[PDB]
Amino acid sequence: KVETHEFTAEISQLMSLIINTVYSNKEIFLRELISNASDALDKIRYQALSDPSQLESEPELFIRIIPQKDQKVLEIRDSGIGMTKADLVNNLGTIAKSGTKSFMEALSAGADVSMIGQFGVGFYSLFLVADHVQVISKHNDDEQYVWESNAGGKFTVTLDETNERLGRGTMLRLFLKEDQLEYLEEKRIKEVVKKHSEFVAYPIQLVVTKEVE
Numbered sequence: 411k412v413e414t415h416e417f418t419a420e421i422s423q424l425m426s427l428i429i430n431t432v433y434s435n436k437e438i439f440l441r442e443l444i445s446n447a448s449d450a451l452d453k454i455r456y457q458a459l460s461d462p463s464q465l466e467s468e469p470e471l472f473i474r475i476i477p478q479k480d481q482k483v484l485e486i487r488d489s490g491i492g493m494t495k496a497d498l499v500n501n502l503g504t505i506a507k508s509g510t511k512s513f514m515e516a517l518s519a520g521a522d523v524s525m526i527g528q529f530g531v532g533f534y535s536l537f538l539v540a541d542h543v544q545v546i547s548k549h550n551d552d553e554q555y556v557w558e559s560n561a562g563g564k565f566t567v568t569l570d571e572t573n574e575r576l577g578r579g580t581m582l583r584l585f586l587k588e589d590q591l592e593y594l595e596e597k598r599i600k601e602v603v604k605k606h607s608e609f610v611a612y613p614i615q616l617v618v619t620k621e622v623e
């Protein structure tokens with residue numbers, strides 16, 4: 411049962427700006443998305459100070475990076491607060507207008523694309539390295555949904571009947587551009603994290619498939 415929606419025109423233009431930009435340091439997308447994940451963890455951490463049962467859906471607090479070389483997919487999963495169905499429809503598409511106008515203007519004045527997070531639209535930095543993205547999410551006391559976009563004019567939101575259960579949190583599935591498959595590599599991923607994400611309150615886990623010989 412696939413609900414369709416349309417992007418606000420601003421978000422669609424931000425999505426087209428980023429998915430096209432020629433930019434040298436495209437690796438900063440990873441700092442942005444780990445930064446979101448850290449924020450989403452902060453928020454479940456807060457609720458669990460008041461109410462510790464909130465952590466029972468997924469007791470470990472982590473950020474986890476899962477290269478899927480078979481599918482040319484990089485997955486970024488956190489055990490954060492997660493997002494409701496309505497959250498997905500508004501937080502992604504249908505909102506964010508404030509930061510996006512400011513940011514498009516700062517760029518025309520010379521701003522470095524790496525400053526996108528100061529305007530709080532760093533999520534869309536993912537399109538530096540990807541042309542398709544799925545967002546899977548599960549908030550305590552609500553069901554698991556998946557949100558999907560092609561950087562175009564519509565996005566779907568649909569109940570999640572095909573993915574591993576998150577327990578609680580959010581997982582981004584980046585369909586990497588063909589020029590950008592370096593970000594599936596264990597060494598590459600190690601460099602960017604230690605370079606850009608040294609001060610993260612939570613363990614950053616990298617998942618490596620290694621053949622036994």
Ligand SMILES: Nc1ncnc2c1ncn2[C@@H]1O[C@H](COP(=O)(O)OP(=O)(O)NP(=O)(O)O)[C@@H](O)[C@H]1O
Nearest residue numbers: 445446447449450488490492501530531532533580
């Ligand atoms: N990994 C994630 N886990 C949970 N919610 C997320 C995640 N990434 C994005 N979101 C939600 O989607 C919105 C879009 O992200 P972005 O456009 O980068 O906003 P932000 O205001 O910089 N993020 P934050 O400081 O993490 O609340 C956020 O405000 C969150 O509400």
